[PDB]
């Protein structure tokens, strides 16, 4: 049976969300690509370059007009007439708008596509702007994080394929399944928080016992994501488990909320 067409485009970005996707443990990214979707355009993986890649993009969005899903990683810069991000000699925003117009729905992977992420941190030299401030007439599912968790990305994909619908979202467009609760609502160090048992300096006796990272700047109390439950890299760890407070990386504006080491 044919597979659902997917076009994956890249604006200003670091490629962490694409990397995160290939770390999926179940289903393997290999199996997603071979068996669950038809990944029909992706600059990071595709054989064709240049004019041949432009032909793929054109052919897919034309033949599958109204039927493909658009995945976006990164964001468009509004500065310098958009020429802070150039594709095929034109502003990236032109490619985003053309891809969006034919899409049935859009997945904004990562904090860049969802909110702005590091390039939009003060003073935002390029006037980087999230996807939903440019594309205003399409469903957009925001999957924030820098990057989002690998098996969250693959679970959202499998959900959509299996159930043939978009995930239910909160008021910000984030899937309820993984973004409905705070990191701090499911944190294994919460017993220490509630007891007043805190790391006060790195590698102190508290740190060696896994005490709470609140006083070291943990932003878990204000951050919605699945890192403390699903965890990272086939469930091996998450930031807090390995001794660093949450940075807040799934939340809009997290770079400009003060130092990472200042208390929430």
């Amino acid at each position: 049976k044919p597979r659902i067409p997917v076009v994956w485009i890249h604006g200003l970005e670091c490629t962490c969300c694409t990397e995160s996707f290939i770390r999926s443990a179940h289903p393997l990214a290999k199996d997603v690509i071979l068996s669950l979707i038809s990944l029909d355009y992706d600059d990071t993986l595709m054989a064709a370059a240049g004019t041949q890649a432009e032909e793929v993009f054109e052919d897919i969005i034309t033949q599958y007009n109204g039927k493909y899903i658009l995945a976006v990683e990164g964001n468009p810069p509004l500065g310098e007439q958009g020429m802070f991000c150039i594709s095929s000699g034109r502003p990236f925003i032109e490619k985003l708008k053309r891809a969006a117009a034919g899409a049935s729905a859009i997945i904004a992977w990562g904090t860049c596509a969802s909110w702005g992420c590091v390039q939009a941190a003060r003073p935002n030299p390029t006037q980087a702007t999230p996807i939903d401030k440019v594309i205003t007439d399409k469903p957009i599912i925001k999957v924030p994080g820098c990057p989002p968790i690998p098996d969250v990305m693959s679970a959202i994909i499998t959900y959509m394929v299996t159930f043939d619908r978009l995930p239910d979202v909160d008021r910000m467009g984030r899937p309820l399944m993984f973004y409905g609760q705070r990191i701090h609502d499911k944190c294994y160090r919460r017993a220490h928080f509630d007891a007043g048992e805190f790391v006060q300096s790195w590698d102190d006796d508290a740190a060696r016992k896994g005490y709470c990272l609140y006083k070291m700047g943990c932003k878990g109390p204000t951050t919605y994501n699945a890192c403390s439950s699903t965890r990272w890299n086939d469930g091996v760890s998450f930031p807090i488990q390995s001794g660093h407070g949450c940075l807040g990386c799934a939340e809009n504006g997290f770079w400009d909320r003060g130092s990472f080491y200042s208390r929430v």
Partner: protein
């Protein structure tokens, strides 16, 4: 049109212009243009970074302790290396010395990234330049098994396995949804592998896609997550507790056992899959030992990496040597000093930036990042470029030079430096590789050689992982658990004004971060990254960078199908987000 001479090349922009935009199977955004003569030989090459974000500007006024987290987001592919350079730079500025275990763990983080990044590049990025995926459908599974078994002890080689892989590919393309294989260069005359080698390589592409996810579990243990693990100024946040109450909240024996299991698996995969495949590519593509030399027989640069003596960044400590060669003189490996204002300098005369004097180079402590999009007299217009004008400003990438020389960085550069400094392991590995191919040492200075050196370095790094792990365990056995120094954590302990340099060898080459702190805040933060060197535009003398040089003089079989250009560019593993930051 114009013609001029530089670095032994004749740069001639008469004749037909070809454009490749987008370049795919890279990180980030690149445009390449070339001119080709009537004989289908490249006479001019133009490297353009087509993105910019401005991390150096964003970092101003931040707390130095936070800088690592921002600059880590320069790139998610080479993830961690900017964080490492950053904590090195801030520690250098303030005068912080980290405990031995923190240094060892940082070296494990770096070696893990080398293994991962080199492996994925080989298969997922460069592989399809060498392996004709569609031709794998014509292979005989039994002959594929016999080929694989002649090359390696790797277990996964049955005829039934190769048949199953072949049938999966047949099913994949049966509905006409070719996905990442659509409109590729399949059947180009430069694809030289026989069908059985294409099927072997394709199977391995899939095995590597699956296996790479395991390598980064080492990053998850010590750094929380991958991509984008966590670090601190003063060491690492992954406190260790082996034998005390509360070890369940720390790096304990079970966590260390997980790390050891990944190290073993990673070495096995690299040594028995990637190494024999790289040699096989060599065996069937020997002419590519003479294509794409570029600057690699002229000027190469390494800063060095993997300090074995904690907090000592000198020659006796760095396990991956540093040095520079210019003028093709590999008998004179020169020392590099990242504070010397006459050594590393960046020019912007051909880049989209403002300087007070664009005819001179600025050392990074004097660096300026003042973006200025000014493509000048393009064919087309400033928002619709048909041809860049390489006589004017043509890239978001600054042009770094070393003592005024254009240099190549990365695996080949490092290999050449270490070889010519007399590093015994490097000499033995290179000599055995080139002997297996019946090629001279000069054959490494080429597009094929870049790929061979990358494979060498994955094997080297996998061995160093074990070495570092064993060093960590030796410290633990001796009761040395410390992972952070905190006596200069608080800003009031810092100098009112100070500056520092953090440097390493990222997978793609020499990386430096230059930081100045004043009154508790970042006053200046300048990055020069490996792909900044390699993808550099021209300088005031018209000297060309490594990519442009490597593309010069290349024959194309079919001008409209840029396979030869892709092969050479991909052999550097371009990271365009790194290059521009």
């Amino acid at each position: 049109s114009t013609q001029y001479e530089t670095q032994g090349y004749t740069i001639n922009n008469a004749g037909r212009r070809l454009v490749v935009d987008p370049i795919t199977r890279i990180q980030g955004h690149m445009r390449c243009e070339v001119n080709i003569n009537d004989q289908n030989v490249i006479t001019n090459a133009v490297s353009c970074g087509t993105m910019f974000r401005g991390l150096e500007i964003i970092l101003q006024g931040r707390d130095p302790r936070d800088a690592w987290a921002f600059v880590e987001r320069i790139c998610g592919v080479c993830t961690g290396v900017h964080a490492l350079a950053s904590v090195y730079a801030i520690e250098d500025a303030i005068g912080i010395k980290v405990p031995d275990n923190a240094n060892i763990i940082r070296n494990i983080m770096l070696a893990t990234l080398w293994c991962h990044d080199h492996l994925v590049h080989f298969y997922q990025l460069a592989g399809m330049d060498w392996i004709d995926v569609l031709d794998a459908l014509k292979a005989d599974p039994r002959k594929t098994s016999e080929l694989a078994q002649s090359l390696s002890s790797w277990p996964k080689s049955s005829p039934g396995y190769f048949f199953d892989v072949q049938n999966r590919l047949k099913k994949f393309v049966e509905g006409g949804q070719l996905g990442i294989f659509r409109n590729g260069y399949w059947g180009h005359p430069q694809y030289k592998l026989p069908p059985e080698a294409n099927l072997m390589g394709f199977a391995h592409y899939l095995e590597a896609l699956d296996f790479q996810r395991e390598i980064v579990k080492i990053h998850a243990v010590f750094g929380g997550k991958n991509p984008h693990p966590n670090w601190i100024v003063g060491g690492m946040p992954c406190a260790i507790n082996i034998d005390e109450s509360g070890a369940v909240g720390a790096v304990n024996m079970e966590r260390l056992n997980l790390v050891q299991s990944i190290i073993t698996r990673t070495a096995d995969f690299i040594n028995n899959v990637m190494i024999p495949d790289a040699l096989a590519i060599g065996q069937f593509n020997k002419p590519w030992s003479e294509i794409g030399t570029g600057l690699s027989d002229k000027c190469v640069l390494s800063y060095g990496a993997f300090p074995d003596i904690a907090n000592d960044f000198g020659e006796k400590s760095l396990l991956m040597p540093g040095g520079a060669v210019i003028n093709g003189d590999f008998n004179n490996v020169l020392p590099v000093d990242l504070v010397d204002p006459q050594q590393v300098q960046e020019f912007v005369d051909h880049a989209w930036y403002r300087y007070p004097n664009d005819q001179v180079g600025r050392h990074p402590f004097d660096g300026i990042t003042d973006p200025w999009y000014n493509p000048g007299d393009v064919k087309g217009s400033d928002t619709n470029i048909q041809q860049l004008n390489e006589q004017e400003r043509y890239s978001w990438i600054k042009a770094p030079r070393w003592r005024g020389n254009a240099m190549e960085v990365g695996p080949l550069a490092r290999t050449l430096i270490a070889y010519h400094k007399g590093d015994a392991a490097t000499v033995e590995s290179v000599d055995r590789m080139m002997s297996a191919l019946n090629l001279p040492l000069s054959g490494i200075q080429s597009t094929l050689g870049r790929i061979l050196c990358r494979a060498h370095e994955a094997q080297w790094a996998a061995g160093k992982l074990q070495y570092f792990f064993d060093k960590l365990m030796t410290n633990l056995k001796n009761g040395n658990l410390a992972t952070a120094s905190t006596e200069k954590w608080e800003p009031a302990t810092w100098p009112t004004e100070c500056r520092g340099v953090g440097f390493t060898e990222a997978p793609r080459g020499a990386l430096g971060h230059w930081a100045a702190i004043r009154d508790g805040k970042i006053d200046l933060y300048q990055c020069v990254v490996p792909t900044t060197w390699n993808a550099s535009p021209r300088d005031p003398k018209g000297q060309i960078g490594a990519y442009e040089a490597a593309l010069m003089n290349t024959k194309m079989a079919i001008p409209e199908q840029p396979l030869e250009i892709l092969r050479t560019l991909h052999s550097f593993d371009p990271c365009l987000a790194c290059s521009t930051h």
